[model samples]
Target chain A: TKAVCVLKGDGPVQGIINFEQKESNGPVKVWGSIKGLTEGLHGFHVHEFGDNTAGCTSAGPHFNPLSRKHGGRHVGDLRNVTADKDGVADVSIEDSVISLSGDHCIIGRTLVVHEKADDLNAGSRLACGVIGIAQ
Target chain B: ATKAVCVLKGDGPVQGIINFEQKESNGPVKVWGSIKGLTEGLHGFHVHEFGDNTAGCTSAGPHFNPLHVGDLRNVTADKDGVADVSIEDSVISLSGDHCIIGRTLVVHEKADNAGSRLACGVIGIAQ
Candidate 1:
């Protein structure tokens, strides 16, 4: 199955994060484009819930089903995304810890983009979007 | 096993839900689901490869055919945009090698040709 996240917020950064699970036991391909980000690296990861009722706050913490550390290669743990000087973020990567199907499926989850670098330390969420099955 | 689907669009919230249950363990699993809140008319249905809801039903891959089953089963909707489907095939299973757990089920705007994904659900193991 494949899915996407269309970010929502007042920030100029807007675009989508595409996810594709090409194989049942394989990784999920993460790729997409975002406009209006700062010209530097930013944090990105899958949150626990799909709720956007209270914005990124409602998205909860990282989707760490295994209850691992903040940067322990959790299913929701991902590399920081970099944006160009034009404030555009283009990302394409793969994650094997998660799946579009199975016990660790990522459906009904949220993708959050931080206002600053993740650094595995701290950052505030800038935008959020609920991941949905794509057509 | 049982699963549920939430239908949506680029411009609206969830439109409806469809619940599926695996009725038999003998031959082709007897799959049945009750749908509601459709627009009325025929809608395309199929077993997708992934249960990922990251993007919507579109992320669910093409029709499921692990064993190269001759024909693919599709769903038809009633005038009320509701579809009640029950059919059997030898292609899929609830457990074993060809199990469909973690896969997705999709409903389209049209029969199978006009490709507009309307809704999707992930197949999960039931208690």
Candidate 2:
């Protein structure tokens, strides 16, 4: 299955992220093109709710389903995107814990671009979007 | 592609997709979608000026620069809480001055009243 998210924000931020899953239980191929950002790395994640009725802040927390400890990992713990000096980030990576089907599906979840590095913690939501089914 | 789309989702477990297209550049746009998880009634549908979700639909701004509504007709939800929408409108476009390229489409709580934001989606050039 394939999916896409058109990220947007209150300011001059926007993005288009694409996902592809070759199997029900496998890594998701994630790629994105984002603009209107500051230089350096920005924390990226899959949040819990796709709802933005309260701004992207209403998107809730990360999609950390369950973890054994604070330092433990979750599917929502995604990578950071390094924007060039011109504020453009082209991201392409593959990781596990994110699935497009079965018990770990994320079709109706949310995506957020934070304003800092996620060293397990991050800053304000720069942009947000709902991950939806795509052809 | 020379089209656009938005994925509508609400905290109420409501979600859907709207696809937009035009016959030519700067032409009148055609919009259609399947929205679900709404109560049966005529709900307000609009194209707000901004796609800003930083404050929910509250930050999406009023209808397209524009409306008190930019109303794309009343969307009547069936008993199943689904609104299958197909409409042709020129009040909005996919190109030119009023281009909706980074704007928002909001589904409201009621057909009138500029009600609560039921769901919101950002329009973008589809690839």
Q: Estimate the TM-score of every prediction.
A: 0.55, 0.55
Q: What CAPRI class is candidate 1? A: incorrect
lDDT of 2 by residue, B1-127 (tens): 2567777766676677888888787667888878999999898888876655545566677777642435675788899999999998876776556666556788989886757988887664452
Question: Candidate 1: where is the Cα deviation over 4 Å?
Answer: B1-127
Q: State the C-alpha lDDT per candidate.
A: 0.65, 0.75
Interface RMSD of 1: 6.6
Residue A48 error for model 2, in Å? 0.5
Interface RMSD of each: 6.6, 10.0
Fraction of native Cα contacts reproduced by each candidate: 0.05, 0.00
- First chain of model 2: TM-score? 0.93
Per-model B-chain TM-score = 0.71, 0.90
Q: Candidate 2 at residue A47, lDDT?
A: 75
lDDT for model 2, on a 0 to 1 scale? 0.75
Q: What is the per-residue lDDT of model 1 for residues A18-98, given as tens digits with 9 covering 90 to 100?
A: 889878999899999878898998888887765554667867788877888877266787758899999998999888887
